[PDB]
Design a protein around this motif. Structure first.
Motif, PDB file in Angstrom:
ATOM      1  N   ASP A  72       4.178  13.850  -1.986  1.00  0.00           N
ATOM      2  CA  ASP A  72       2.597  13.615  -1.755  1.00  0.00           C
ATOM      3  C   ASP A  72       2.389  13.156  -0.105  1.00  0.00           C
ATOM      4  O   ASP A  72       3.323  12.454   0.477  1.00  0.00           O
ATOM      5  CB  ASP A  72       1.806  12.554  -2.740  1.00  0.00           C
ATOM      6  CG  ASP A  72       1.519  13.181  -3.840  1.00  0.00           C
ATOM      7  OD1 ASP A  72       2.093  14.329  -4.335  1.00  0.00           O
ATOM      8  OD2 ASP A  72       1.333  12.502  -4.634  1.00  0.00           O
ATOM      9  N   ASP A  74       0.328  11.122   0.626  1.00  0.00           N
ATOM     10  CA  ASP A  74       0.366   9.718   0.765  1.00  0.00           C
ATOM     11  C   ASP A  74       1.823   8.689   0.589  1.00  0.00           C
ATOM     12  O   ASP A  74       1.873   7.671   0.218  1.00  0.00           O
ATOM     13  CB  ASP A  74      -1.012   9.207   0.051  1.00  0.00           C
ATOM     14  CG  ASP A  74      -0.683   9.444  -1.521  1.00  0.00           C
ATOM     15  OD1 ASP A  74      -0.951   8.526  -2.246  1.00  0.00           O
ATOM     16  OD2 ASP A  74      -0.090  10.415  -1.805  1.00  0.00           O
ATOM     17  N   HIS A 187       4.891   5.025  -1.977  1.00  0.00           N
ATOM     18  CA  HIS A 187       3.729   5.913  -2.354  1.00  0.00           C
ATOM     19  C   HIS A 187       2.661   5.108  -2.284  1.00  0.00           C
ATOM     20  O   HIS A 187       2.371   3.984  -3.038  1.00  0.00           O
ATOM     21  CB  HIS A 187       3.931   6.158  -3.868  1.00  0.00           C
ATOM     22  CG  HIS A 187       3.226   7.375  -4.359  1.00  0.00           C
ATOM     23  ND1 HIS A 187       3.417   8.284  -5.527  1.00  0.00           N
ATOM     24  CD2 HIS A 187       1.972   7.751  -3.941  1.00  0.00           C
ATOM     25  CE1 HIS A 187       2.566   9.057  -5.572  1.00  0.00           C
ATOM     26  NE2 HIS A 187       1.639   8.917  -4.630  1.00  0.00           N
TER      27      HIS A 187
HETATM   28 MN   LIG Z   1      -0.112  10.544  -4.153  1.00  0.00          MN
END
Ligand SMILES: [Mn+2]
Length: 199
Positions: A72, A74, A187
């Motif tokens: 991801d 992030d 994360h």
């Molecule tokens: Mn994420």
């Protein structure tokens, strides 16, 4: 093995995570694919499923890949461990395994968190099927691609996936604050200003 790390984001935090992942690939000789593109399908479910379309673009660009790693936007690489390869945190030697995923217990809402997802090249056609399910009930309901992998894919591939502990490779910051220091992939699951501040 030959690893291609892929990600995408169409944002300060997201540029900073990109940089670190891009740097991390450069250190260890991994391929880096980043979808900087704008999505045709912009509904909430379709954006979550988009990772399964991006992997197809990554494979076109890097066909010699053995392992595709979705991260991801992030998720970043922990600066402390940026000099350690992925293989120092996970055994990818079993030729039968198609997926390495990670749980989020007991803080998380679902049996796996696909924010970090290892996909073998032999599962590319499977990711094609996940993408194709994006507008099909119940797969178009939350948590989307993550539900589709766990509930549609996994039952069909017995013995061909492993659900790992998340502490090093999918370390949700708010959930595992005692593990963040020693993690490889951090994360920021659980807000843009919060994420920029973190980055
Ligand atoms: Mn994420």
């Amino acid at each position: 093995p030959c690893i291609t790390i892929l990600s995408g984001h169409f944002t300060i935090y997201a540029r900073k995570t990109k940089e670190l992942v891009e740097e991390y690939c450069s250190i260890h000789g991994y391929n880096f694919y980043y979808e900087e593109s704008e999505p045709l399908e912009t509904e909430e479910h379709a954006l979550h499923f988009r990772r399964s379309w991006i992997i197809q673009q990554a494979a076109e660009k890097f066909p010699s890949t053995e392992w595709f790693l979705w991260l991801d936007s992030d998720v970043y690489v922990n600066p402390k461990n940026k000099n350690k390869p992925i293989t120092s945190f996970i055994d990818l030697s079993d030729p039968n395994i198609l997926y390495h995923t990670f749980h989020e217990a007991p803080w998380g809402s679902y049996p796996i968190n696909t924010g970090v997802k290892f996909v073998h090249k032999d599962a590319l056609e499977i990711e094609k099927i996940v993408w194709s399910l994006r507008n099909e009930a119940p797969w178009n309901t939350f948590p989307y691609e993550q539900k589709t992998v766990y509930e549609y894919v996994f039952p069909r591939i017995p013995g061909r996936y492993i659900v790992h502990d998340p502490y090093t490779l999918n370390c949700i910051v708010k959930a595992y604050p005692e593990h963040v220091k020693d993690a490889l992939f951090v994360h920021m699951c659980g807000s843009r200003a919060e994420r920029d501040e973190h980055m």
